[model samples]
Every structure is written in C-alpha cells, then in structure tokens.
Target: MTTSQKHRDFVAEPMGEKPVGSLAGIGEVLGKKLEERGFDKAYVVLGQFLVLKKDEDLFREWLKDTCGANAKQSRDCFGCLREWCDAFL
Candidate 1:
C-alpha cells in the first residue's frame, strides 16, 4: 500500500517525545482531544498501540473511541506505527 508523507515522516524516526499531533492521522483537533484525555505525548499513544499488539481492528477501535478518529485516520496511524515497528522494533 502507498503511504502519506506524514506517515513516512513519522515512521522515519524514533517517536521520542513528539507531540501527539505529530502522529499521522492525529491533527490539531484530535491531538487536543487526546491531550485533554491525558495522552499528550506520541510515545504514550505508541504504548497503547504496542499494548494492542498492533492489532489493526483493536487499535482502530481504541483510537476511534478515544478521540473520534475516523477509519482512514485510524488506518493511517496504524500503518505508521506498524511500519515503525517493523523497521525499529
């Protein structure tokens, strides 16, 4: 599958302490909502992704339920993290 620039950019490096908005699919609004819900750092949500064992459906569902991410958003974010893991983990 093809990837977005945001996805390539994100997966290209270690997440570090980047803002949640730095994640693919998480824009300003969703990032704010995530922060409001106590997920301020990208690594924190990356933790959630790992804990879900990279299960696309579960990760997508959690993201949707947590911050109202749509299917494409969730999938994009999932693909980003999944690629990162494949490369770095």
Candidate 2:
C-alpha cells in the first residue's frame, strides 16, 4: 500500500540528509514549503513526527496547514516516515 517504491525505499534504511523533494508525495513544491517552515531535511521532520507522537490527525493536519498538502500526499508522507521510524528507530 505504499505510494511507490520511493516510499518503500525510504523505510528500508536511514535517510541521509536527503532532500524532502526526494521523499514520497513531497515534490519540490511541497518540499520547499516545508523547508521554509524550518523542516529542511527528511529526518528533521522525524523529530516533529515524534513530537506529534505520530498521531495521524496531527501529522496530516500539520502537513496540510504547513505545505498545503492534500490528504493523499499527507498520508503518503506520514506512512513512509512512520514506517521508517518504526523500522529504524
């Protein structure tokens, strides 16, 4: 149920300062927006994920408000990051 292999790949290992644009569903459009809000890296978002305790609504709502992400795109990132954390952390 991944958005694509990009989401799958992100969960398989550590993210090494990768571009948020490189993440699932977060194109350069949303990535740069998130960057403007001070979340400039893939893992930097992880901190907030945990800060939000990975709550689905919190993540999706924040994603929506933060970057104007649609529900699908927000779900895409939340799941990928959640799996990445559950698997790696």
Residue-wise lDDT of candidate 1 within 1-34, one digit each (tens)? 4888888899988888999988889999889999
Local distance difference test, each candidate: 0.90, 0.87
Distance from true location, Cα of 5 in model 1, Å: 1.1
| Model 1 C-alpha lDDT versus the unseen true structure | 0.90
Q: Estimate each model's TM-score.
A: 0.94, 0.92
lDDT of 2 by residue, 1-89 (tens): 73698898888888989878767879889999999999899988888888999998998898899999998898889989888888988
Cα-based lDDT at residue 84, candidate 2? 88
- Which residue pairs in candidate 2 collide? none
TM value for model 2? 0.92
| Candidate 2 regions with alpha-carbon error over 4 angstroms | none
| Model 1 residue pairs with clashes | none
What local lDDT score does residue 75 receive in model 1, on the 0 to 100 scale?
90
